[PDB]
Amino acid sequence: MFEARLVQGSILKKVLEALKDLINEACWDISSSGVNLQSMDSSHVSLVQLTLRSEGFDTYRCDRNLAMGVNLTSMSKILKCAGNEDIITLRAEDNADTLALVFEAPNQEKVSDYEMKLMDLDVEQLGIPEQEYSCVVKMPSGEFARICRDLSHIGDAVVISCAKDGVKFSASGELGNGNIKLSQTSNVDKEEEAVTIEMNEPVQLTFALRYLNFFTKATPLSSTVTLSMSADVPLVVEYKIADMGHLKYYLAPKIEDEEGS
Amino acid sequence: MFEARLVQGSILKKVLEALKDLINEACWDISSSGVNLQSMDSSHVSLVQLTLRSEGFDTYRCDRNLAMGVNLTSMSKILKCAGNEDIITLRAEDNADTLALVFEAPNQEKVSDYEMKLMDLDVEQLGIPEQEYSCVVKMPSGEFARICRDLSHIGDAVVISCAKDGVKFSASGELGNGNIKLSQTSNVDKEEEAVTIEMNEPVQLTFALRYLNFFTKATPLSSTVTLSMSADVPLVVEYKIADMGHLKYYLAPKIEDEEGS
Amino acid sequence: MFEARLVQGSILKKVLEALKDLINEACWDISSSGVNLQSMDSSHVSLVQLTLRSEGFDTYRCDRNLAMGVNLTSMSKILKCAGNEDIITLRAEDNADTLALVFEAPNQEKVSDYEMKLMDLDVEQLGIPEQEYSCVVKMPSGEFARICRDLSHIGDAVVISCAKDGVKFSASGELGNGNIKLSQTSNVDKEEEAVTIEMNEPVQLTFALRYLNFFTKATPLSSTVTLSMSADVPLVVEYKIADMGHLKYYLAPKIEDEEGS
Amino acid sequence: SSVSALKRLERSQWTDKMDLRFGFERLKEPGEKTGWLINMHPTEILDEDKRLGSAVDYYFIQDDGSRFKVALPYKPYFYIATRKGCEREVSSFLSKKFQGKIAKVETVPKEDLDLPNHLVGLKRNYIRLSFHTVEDLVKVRKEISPAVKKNREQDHASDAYTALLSSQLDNIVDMREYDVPYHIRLSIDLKIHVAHWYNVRYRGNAFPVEITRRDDLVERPDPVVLAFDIETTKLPLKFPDAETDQIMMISYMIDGQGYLITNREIVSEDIEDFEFTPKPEYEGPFCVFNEPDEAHLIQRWFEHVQETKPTIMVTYNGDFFDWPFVEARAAVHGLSMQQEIGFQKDSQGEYKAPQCIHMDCLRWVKRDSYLPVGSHNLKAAAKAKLGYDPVELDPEDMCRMATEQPQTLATYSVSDAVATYYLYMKYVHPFIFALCTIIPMEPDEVLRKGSGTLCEALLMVQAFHANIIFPNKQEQEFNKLTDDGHVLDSETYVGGHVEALESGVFRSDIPCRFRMNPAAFDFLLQRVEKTLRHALEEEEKVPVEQVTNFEEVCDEIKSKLASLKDVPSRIECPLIYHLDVGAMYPNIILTNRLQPSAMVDEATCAACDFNKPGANCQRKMAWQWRGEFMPASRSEYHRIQHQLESEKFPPLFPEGPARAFHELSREEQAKYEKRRLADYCRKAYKKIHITKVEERLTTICQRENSFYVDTVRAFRDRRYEFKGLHKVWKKKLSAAVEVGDAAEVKRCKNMEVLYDSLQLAHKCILNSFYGYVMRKGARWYSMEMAGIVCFTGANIITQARELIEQIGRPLELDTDGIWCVLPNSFPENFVFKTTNVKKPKVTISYPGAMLNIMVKEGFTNDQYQELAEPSSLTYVTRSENSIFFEVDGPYLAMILPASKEEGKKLKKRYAVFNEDGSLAELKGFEVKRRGELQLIKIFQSSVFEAFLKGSTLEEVYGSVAKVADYWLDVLYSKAANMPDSELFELISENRSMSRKLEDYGEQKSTSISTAKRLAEFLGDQMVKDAGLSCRYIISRKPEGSPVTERAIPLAIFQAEPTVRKHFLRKWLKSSSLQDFDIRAILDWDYYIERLGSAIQKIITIPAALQQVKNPVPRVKHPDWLHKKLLEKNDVYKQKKISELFTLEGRRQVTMA
DNA sequence: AGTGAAAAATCTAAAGCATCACCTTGCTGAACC
DNA sequence: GGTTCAGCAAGGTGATGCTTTAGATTTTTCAT
Ligand code: SF4
Ligand SMILES: [Mg+2]
Ligand SMILES: [Mg+2]
């Protein structure tokens, strides 16, 4: 008997529509600390980490740790049934694999409830180690997602350089080179249009833009995305849905073939 | 010698968009009673009736009963250039083998006449059985379009229940079973978003969601749609447009084999 | 090099969005008069010219008459990176062997360089026969484009005729015959729907409508289309507003001199 | 019917007097005579009682040529099974319906091949109905067959009613033997086989003919065999016509003596006798006869055939150009070939004389010679088999050679004749007769008929030795019901798994790469002693204790295999192998005890009362099933069946009456029902074609009748027996050539050629079993059997691929065998010096032994049993593992093509080149079909003849780049330097036109447009005789219009110039054009795109997959391959996540 | 070096479906009387 | 303190490019 209330039901839509496009199967974990989603790609490259706590979930209780291996190509066809202002109530059973949803209209005119049977699978777990994770930058999610979608046509991979003179997004392609610079306009009282860039060293590291497309699908969750990088480490991306939780998403880079011999 | 006026162009443009999918060939009937169209769909399961009374037109003067047999897809192809504000006129002659019609604007600048030929085929004129309707629901068309496109993704065979509390849609299938309830709206006096229930005895039967989508794609016609059901009759869809006339759908339910049920 | 200043750069991105099917590869010619494109399409039918005058832009800076043969559809996939409110700034270079285009956000915190190596093809220039045509018509491109996309799909060939009372467009097809008549506006001074016709002698021509709404659809760059037409000459289709837009098409009559019979 | 009776009577004594003057005098004297059978034909010989009757005449040859013909009476056969317990009154009604039409009706019990509960001795019984003549049989066939079809639905309905219960003419339940011919059924029931020494006993006239086999005389007499070949006059650049052109020369070849008859009307001078000897085993003695005109030439030919009297006549493509031409030249000159040698056309367009077997080597080259397809001409077959080059001569220039000098033209003609005759008697004459000793069919029909009906004839022979009733032809059943409840559209077994895993140039001199996994090598080091032990004990069937020299070959094996461990990655020359049984599939029938009549479902298996677990009665085997069907349900089908009953519907018969439901045939209502469901599910169910692919297990019973199994068993071990006998007589010859015993060496040469031909024919039929099983509609064809055989072939061959991927670089997976390479340091072939006197040397194959242990250890089966002696009730227990993957030897070259999209697999496309440069095999290429363009033929020949140059991949692609650069530079310069006269032949494409212009209706295509242009050329007069296949090119100047409406013929260009110019301006829709020469209206873009697609799919894409730069840099790669190649070579690469992030656990949601 | 006919690969037109820019509308904030 | 008009977020909607299904055409394969 699990319950999970969410009054602002558009954010569950916005997280779930961002994981169909490059994850086929992810295994939700539930415990007293909240709900987690620690799951790798089926292509075995980049990995998801949802963490949502109980200070945004209104009606919420959970006394046992368990897991459910939900499918992602079929769960994001039954959640857009609610509109952008409906409230969403998840329910679950101890012994049954049936996950139930409740979509309730805010004006009390359309009540729907859903059941979905699930299946058990066998995936891997990749825990994160704690590191410096410097060169942290904060950008608007709309601008970053817009430019990430834009650079997909000119190139297939990106070189990201955190240096003193802003941030360098240089995609590498056969036709031309498209590079993006972010200026430190720190003299703004508004946090939306003012970017924060702090660092310990200039870091140059390269990533797969074809995965950055399916990556950047989580646009309208948080107004500001916070991305951070270091050397020889996967990029970390935080989409902080500050009412309860945050999406950390980790993308492994491309590196050289060490020193040739 | 026939003549007809419309001070609005939305309805006559959108009926052809609403009806082009079920019917490929039709037989119009123009007379002093107005416009009649009884037709089978190309699979001979669903029945359609397009009826326009004579008093709904601005001026409607004719000669006598004439059955004419052009198809419908050509009419929707040629007439959809008209907008939702252009005014409509159609003229005809008995000796002439073609029917003319002008799309005119109130400023008398944008104007276009089209004359259409008469290809002749006469389908059988079957008598529509008229009986009582045990359950009548009068509910908005936008919510009905949303609920039909909602249930199209989950399942294929929708079971619909009419009871005292309201109406209940339900969908089976391999991706779960969905349940949607719509209750009476007694505290809402305005009727462009409320529902209305006329109730005799509880009914429920199984219907095909592709055919429900084919009926519900008539949704810009009216802000409300009257679904009605009785004992084993084809379910009837009433589109009360205006004082101009009606657009009535009839669907036979599917027989479920008792064996393995 | 023509790294000109633009107060708004939506025009270039939409003309590349629309003309991605007309010309498969063009060459940008830039001289002291501005930018002059003259390209002959893939089917070798018409010669399309675009004139963007230098005084229409904010600034001009080139060494001499420079022709850069950049593939037209290749940089169309990258030019929509800029927004409709985005601007193109000014830079000075005399020996640039690789052309770069500058992207500047409206909030002046994002700068971008999109480069392209110099590769060139020599295209033969064609002379344009110019004289005073008999009939020049002027209608807003909205409803003309609307009827051109709503009447090409009932017939392939149109007789286009110009007379004093109203110009007509008559296309026949297997589902019927349609034709369009335009009258003259004299009491109307507003630009949004006025159709002005300068008229010398009534002319008749025959054309194919497939080429007219699909390969030559760049409507929102201007708002009023003007067609110049005369006896025994091809079409002159003009999208023209002020110094911000002037493009033209030269579709030719593909009518034989009765050699079929 | 007296007029037709006297007509066929006159035909009977006409053929009899035709053969009496031709040498085949009848068996009219009472006595006993030996003979050897030659021909088999039906005839209409009567009896002394003057009762109408059909008979059959055999032709018997002697060792000294005192030939004869024996006609014996024999009525045809027919079987009808009726309802049980009431078969007397149906036979009495049948006898009383026709006074004396039926000859005899009788009933004797038999056994059904698929009747359940067969252990208790169940019986099903037919009745035999015999007619006195064949035309009465076909008349009764046409009288009864639609009634049978209609009543079959009635019987089917009755069966359905009976199934529901379980849940006068109309008394006949089924009928068979309507497709077996007369002579064929004759042999099936009498067992009289062509090519066997017989003796005949015939005393008096009232007694019939007695015939008895004399099989101890294993020698065979040489029949007098005349091979002949024409040449005809012709007007240039046109196929010759038989109404105006005439023969200048005939050349023919009778039993080693050659003659040449020449027309002196066209030939300028007489021709003397000459000798032509290409090889010492091919003697060429030749005599010349010269006649003034064609009439005396054909008269000399006819009288010399009448005098020498050849039993077997040999041509090459005789049925196409030879016989219609000579028949028409007889008909022009007041004669006919029917009236002097009896050669007329049959119903199928083939020419079969009543006494002289017309026999055509081209059909054998097409069918059994195993030459590559597209290489079936006589020159190719003579070079492949006889090992010499026939003299070539241009038929365009042969007309001027007919008047300039006749000697070289005569040499060409006699070279054609001697090539045909020696390719006949050295190879295919004892091959055909060895096929004939086992197939009960006359020689012309056993050469003409297909592979499946040859297997059918063998199975009918073994079916009537076993006394079973023949299943009919498997017809197509309309609207088959799936057990799920859906009607079908297509229903298919395993889809022919073909995969080209690599593409590139492969040779025995090229250095290729090997990644060797040492785990399989560690397996092999401890296996190899036992592997060679088992190979010597099973492939040779001798004990290992017999040989003494095991240790030194074992040490050589150890040294080679240990020098293979020393590095995984290595580069040397690979030997090219073909890892398979020649037809694994018959052994897959054998070792699994498979047969098409003993596979059922679980329901009727449980209906049988002898089921028992833990026994051999229930065995199961795996396959996979494919069905494309209709997504509409089953209850809706009853609904639409009810809604399509009792309504008006248009009859197909013009001005017909009001038709009802019952008399409608199944095919018209089947189309109507398919249209109705296609309309119903274009709207409601979102689909009309659902492709379900699933896996199935079938239960194979024990042998109710083992007729399909023991045939293959006896035929395989008789093949091996004949192979051993041929090897024994080959060693006898190999001693006799230095014995010096001329008559004895000639007779043992005859014996070894005979045994070689029996071995070759048995090998061909063993290959033919698979080709018979893989088609639907055969009379013994089982769906599940074909699926099982193809899937187990796939599983075995992918097990072999899984192992061989680590000892080299295997290349091409196939439904016939792995085509792969192996390193040369890997040992290839071992000779054994064995002390046994029966074999001083033993040749054993090392990859063969490895594949033998693969198929032995991988597949151990306990179902094999031997039945030696029923009296002692003994049962030895041993397993049969006879899957012999015979490596055919190291080839010289291997070429693979590639495919035109990202990641699809090719379809049976490769080329294999043998060691002496001869093209060993080719499959799936453009040269297979004689159509398309011959712009491509010369390019493809010049590229496949040019892979055998150079040592490295750089050099071989350099030579291929030279060839492609030459041909694309001829194309790129618009073919300007050479004369243009041959270019119109070279460039244009020729498409046949089968129907008329109005048959397709409103549909328009390229051929329809070309026919319309041809009609616009002259008029309806050309349409009246529009049997000519249309040649065309593609116009260029009307751009935008599709290529389906952009074809112009070359017939306009041969017209007079002014109408050409005007009507070309009419075609091109451009009256302002000025030029008329053929330089710009050619669509060179389409032509260079065709040649570009060829050079992409043959050369450049395999080059990109062989890590080399493009040999044709002016032809760009496709976008997907360009992307993959530019991503691969960049050392900047993608790193995965299991290395950069460690593993923290593995779990599963376990059941509690 | 022929022929004809059927199963399957290939080519082409039309419908499904996710996405993007734009039209219209409800909620709300600051200047005004 | 009521008003009111503009500003802006947001749903509905026409238009669009890619994808998928369906029917006609050639191509291989098998019988001859
Ligand atoms: S397998 Fe089944 S049907 Fe066949 S003999 Fe055994 S029990 Fe009978
Ligand atoms: Mg010949
Ligand atoms: Mg010849």
Residue numbers in the entry:
A (entry chain D), B (entry chain B), C (entry chain C): 1 to 261
D (entry chain A): 27 to 193, 214 to 1198
Copy the relevant paper text.
Replicative polymerases (Pol), such as the leading-strand polymeraseε (Polε) and lagging-strand Polδ, synthesize DNA with extraordinarily high fidelity. The high accuracy is achieved by their 3′-5′ exonuclease activity, which correct errors when they are made by the DNA polymerase (pol). Polε-core interacts with the ring-shaped PCNA sliding clamp to assemble the holoenzyme.
We first asked whether a T/P containing a preexisting mismatch (G•T) can form the expected proofreading intermediates by the Polε–PCNA holoenzyme. Cryo-EM imaging and associated two dimensional (2D) and three dimensional (3D) classifications and 3D reconstruction resulted in two 3D EM maps of the Polε–PCNA–DNA ternary complex at an average resolution of 3.88 Å and 3.81 Å, respectively. Atomic modeling of the two maps shows that Polε-core stably binds to the PCNA and P/T, but the POLE1-CTD and the regulator subunits POLE2-4 are invisible, similar to Polε holoenzyme in the polymerizing state. Notably, the template strand extends to the exo site in both structures, indicating that the T/P with a preexisting mismatch cannot reach the proofreading state in the Polε holoenzyme when the DNA movement is highly constrained by PCNA. Instead, the T/P junction binds just below the Exo and N-term domains in the highly positively charged main substrate chamber, thus placing the holoenzyme in a blocked state. The Exo domain is distant from the thumb in one conformation but interacts with the thumb via a thumb-domain-contacting loop (TCL) in the other conformation. Therefore, the template strand passes through a gap between the TCL and the thumb domain in the first conformation but is blocked by the TCL in the second conformation. While the upper end of the T/P DNA substrate is blocked by Polε, the bottom dsDNA end of the T/P protrudes from PCNA by 6 bp. Remarkably, we found that the tightly coupled PCNA imposes such strong constraints on Polε that a T/P with a preexisting mismatch could not insert from outside of the enzyme into the exo site.
